[PDB]
């Protein structure tokens, strides 16, 4: 029951940017100001990317809090007969929807609903001050959404294809086969899926017709010219009529490009303005190649003062795994905290040679990735990460370079989880966990991005028989033979491995994290040695095994389905460690001091290096090999083997899952600031860390266009309403 609501007491923290703001020159501030705005604008697209009803809910909420703030609306709600606790549930839901840019959780892809009675909420709404100034729109919004706002029907409970779940990346009638047929179409046409959606219409015969729609300001109308424009037309692919179009999110992307172009005026150099230029092209024409071009310049731009990025980037929430969720961020580099990470880059080339694969499976060059520590001013999208490795185009990754970011003010925000909130750890591990967790975190973040995602080469063949490796002389360490598998033109990591692609890659990255933290240089660069370093190493591992148990809450047994890719990866690593045996890890079910079912994880530190290391090395080798050669049959067999959740002894993971569910703790919500223009001077606005303050932070987010933005989301939404 507790899975589908947010609890009234859910944590809220405020991201801290003041001193990072103070560092910025008058020009950098205006650059950042126009960039944040673009980010925030596009962030609203994530709504259409969540659920059918999400746009309506956001418009309903923003209209409510425009007319009355949480304290004014409280007066009305309590006159209407709500208890303070019911009203609080409302705030929390509002905050959650704002926080997620939708009514499904970003971490776990699960629906949440208001924790108060429906007929009660309706009173707070229909009788509100907002309903008095515009009764037409308010009553029309509540009619189109409120049912779906509360509906827990099993098919609505999680994101996904088929009738199992909800997805807006696809029309409701789509299934896994549709997505696969589409993926194949996009590949033969050498067209990226990051920015698209799939809509399916059927005639009276029942014959499926597919619209692949690209995101852009320009409709399919009389364009300028492009690599996109030549592709707008009807095709026939394996018996299926295909139409490629554009104009998705058009009026939202228009606001974005307006702000990017304003930003261009304040750009610090030629790389920044050249990338923004290409960004504008990308969002105007719907050209993903124009994004790649922009990303190239952005990689060239090293150690800026204000760092940022925008676009359709992460493919996590596309059920199939090829489609990206819009996001953008604006951040200030921190020179101090960036010192260590540069020491890390200086020694990275060295450290790569510790990884359990030949130089033939490692990238030919090793350019310098430029790792930096940032303080986030704005992160718009489904959620805020700890660290990032970008961009996501692999050709650029190995021919050009990439950037690594640790966001030091996101880390700082969670040092949280007080001792009583530490589940399944013995008293003595609790102490170490509490002491070394933060430092253990800085390390895993660094190794993960730099050496985890930034290592490894893919074997490719272009239009000709030309390989980026040497075919005849390259030996596969597993097969003792030549390389029989590789990527062809149009093929990508995401297209080939699809469903497991995002997670499999994450599993690889966190495994090198665990593997290389054992090295003493890695640890001294972060400033630890002796009886400190060994403690952070330990907790890193203890942290991983624990997280693999907690991962269980994100598995859906009925569907045999993992809902979060980082959690699945951590469960796989937990299982690889268990399978090694020899006493490294034990899960012992127990009884809680509160009487309910509990459990204990035990890690033996003396066996990490003797048992654990050998196990991970073996695992890593198999992972890279299958990725480089892009072997999907093998890759899937290996990964879906370890990812299988069963009741087999001694673990009994299905049964354990129930104890995990019982003891689960809900993820905190984070409040972000607002930048305001006074004229030449720009200022930073801050908010209370509570549901109310997060609501206000959105209330004041769009002072100019808020009412227009709402109607825009509304119409974008009803236009496509026939598809779900």
């Amino acid at each position: 029951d507790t899975q589908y609501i947010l609890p009234n007491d859910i944590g809220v923290s405020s991201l801290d940017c003041r001193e990072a703001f103070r560092l910025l020159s008058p020009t950098e501030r205006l650059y950042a100001y126009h960039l944040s705005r673009a980010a925030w604008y596009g962030g609203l697209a994530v709504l259409l990317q969540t659920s059918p009803e999400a746009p309506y809910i956001y418009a309903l909420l923003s209209r409510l809090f425009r007319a009355q703030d949480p304290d004014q609306l409280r007066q009305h709600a309590l006159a209407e007969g709500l208890t303070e606790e019911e009203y609080q549930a409302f705030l929390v839901y509002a905050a959650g929807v704002y926080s997620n840019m939708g009514n499904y959780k970003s971490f776990g892809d699960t629906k949440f609903v208001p924790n108060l009675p429906k007929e009660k909420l309706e009173r707070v709404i229909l009788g509100s001050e907002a309903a008095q100034q515009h009764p037409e729109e308010v009553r029309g919004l509540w009619q189109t959404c409120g049912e779906l706002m509360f509906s827990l029907e099993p098919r609505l409970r999680h994101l996904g294809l088929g009738k199992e779940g909800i997805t807006t990346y696809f029309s409701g009638n789509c299934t896994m086969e549709d997505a696969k047929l589409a993926q194949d179409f996009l590949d033969s046409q050498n067209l990226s899926a990051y920015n698209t959606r799939l809509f399916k219409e059927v005639d009276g015969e029942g014959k499926p017709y597919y619209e692949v729609r690209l995101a852009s300001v320009l409709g399919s109308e009389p364009s300028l010219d492009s690599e996109v424009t030549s592709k707008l037309k009807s095709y026939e692919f394996r018996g299926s009529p295909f139409q490629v179009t554009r104009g998705d999110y058009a009026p939202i992307l228009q606001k974005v490009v307006e702000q990017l172009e304003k930003a261009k005026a304040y750009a610090a150099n030629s790389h920044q303005g050249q990338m923004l230029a290409q960004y504008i092209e990308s969002f105007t024409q719907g050209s993903i190649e124009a994004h790649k071009r922009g990303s190239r310049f952005w990689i060239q731009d090293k150690g800026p003062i204000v760092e940022s990025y925008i676009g359709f980037i992460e493919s996590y929430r596309d059920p199939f795994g090829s489609r990206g969720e819009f996001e953008g961020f604006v951040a200030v580099v921190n020179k101090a905290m960036s010192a260590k990470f540069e020491r890390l880059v200086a020694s990275a080339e060295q450290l790569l040679k510790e990884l359990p694969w030949p130089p033939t499976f490692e990238k030919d060059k090793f350019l310098t990735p430029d790792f930096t520590s940032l303080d986030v001013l704005t992160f718009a999208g489904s959620g805020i990460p700890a660290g990032i490795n970008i961009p996501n185009y692999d050709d650029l990754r190995q021919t050009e370079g990439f950037k690594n970011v640790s966001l030091g003010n996101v880390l700082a925000v969670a040092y949280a989880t007080q001792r009583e909130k530490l589940t399944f750890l013995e008293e003595d591990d609790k102490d170490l966990y509490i002491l070394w967790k933060g430092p253990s975190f800085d390390v895993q973040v660094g190794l993960h991005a730099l050496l985890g995602h930034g290592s490894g080469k893919l074997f490719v063949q272009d239009e000709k028989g030309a390989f980026n490796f040497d075919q005849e002389t390259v030996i596969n360490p597993e097969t003792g033979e030549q390389i029989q598998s590789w990527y062809r033109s149009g093929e990508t990591w995401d297209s080939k491995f699809s469903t497991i692609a995002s997670s499999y890659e994450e599993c690889r990255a966190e495994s090198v994290g665990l593997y290389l933290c054992l090295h003493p240089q890695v640890l001294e660069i972060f400033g630890f040695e002796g009886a400190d370093a060994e403690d952070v190493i330990y907790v890193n591992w203890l942290n991983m095994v624990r997280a693999g148990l907690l991962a269980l809450e994100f598995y859906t047994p009925e569907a045999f389905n993992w809902r979060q890719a980082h959690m699945q990866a951590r469960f796989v690593i937990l299982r690889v460690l268990l399978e090694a045996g020899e006493g490294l890890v034990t899960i012992t079910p127990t009884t809680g001091s509160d009487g309910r079912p509990d459990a204990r994880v035990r890690l033996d530190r003396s066996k990490i290096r003797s048992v654990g290391k050998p196990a991970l090395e073996r695992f890593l080798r198999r992972l890279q090999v299958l990725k480089s050669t892009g072997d999907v049959a093998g890759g899937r067999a290996l990964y879906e083997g370890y990812a299988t959740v069963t009741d087999a002894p001694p673990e009994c993971f299905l049964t354990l899952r129930d104890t995990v569910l019982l003891r689960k703790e809900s993820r905190k919500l984070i409040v972000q600031p607002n930048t305001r223009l006074e004229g030449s001077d720009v200022q930073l606005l801050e908010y209370e860390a509570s549901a109310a303050g997060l609501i206000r932070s959105f209330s004041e987010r769009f002072p100019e266009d808020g009412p227009e933005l709402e109607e825009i989301l509304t119409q974008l939404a009803t236009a496509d309403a026939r598809f779900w």
Binding site: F107, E314, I384, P385, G387, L411, V413, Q444, H448, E506
Partner: peptide, 5 residues
């Protein structure tokens, strides 16, 4: 690619 907190 992301690392979550």
């Amino acid at each position: 690619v992301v690392y979550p907190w």
